[PDB]
């Protein structure tokens, strides 16, 4: 079984009806994941959750979005994706802005 360190890649926020922070993750064993918002652990609710694409056969890479539904200026801030497995840790952060702040 091919073992290798967890890795992540984060892309800038895109609007696709809902908002999406796109990402990729990889690793063997399959990594564990967590999101942070301004350094705080982000709990997934029906308005912010992780949504994956179905993975293609014969590949360990996983792609998806942090999907935000109906966000506002309060959701503007620093999003971090954390991944880990036994062979390494990875981390990536971007700034996202969804509405102008009053």
């Amino acid at each position: 079984n091919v073992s290798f360190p967890a890795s992540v890649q984060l892309h800038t926020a895109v609007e696709m009806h809902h908002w999406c922070i796109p990402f990729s993750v990889d690793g063997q064993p399959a990594p564990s994941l967590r999101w942070l918002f301004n350094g705080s652990v982000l709990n997934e609710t029906s308005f912010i959750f992780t949504e994956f694409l179905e993975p293609a056969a014969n590949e360990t890479v996983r792609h998806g979005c942090l999907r935000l539904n109906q966000p506002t200026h309060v959701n503007n801030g620093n999003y971090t994706l954390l991944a880990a497995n036994p062979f390494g840790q990875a981390s990536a952060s971007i700034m996202a802005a969804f509405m102008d702040n009053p």
């Binding site: 399959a30 564990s32 994941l33 994956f52």
Partner: peptide
């Protein structure tokens, strides 16, 4: 963790 995936997603867990 995952709102959509109580048992993880193809190995990936929250």
């Amino acid at each position: 963790g995952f709102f959509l995936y109580p048992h993880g997603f193809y190995g990936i867990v929250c």
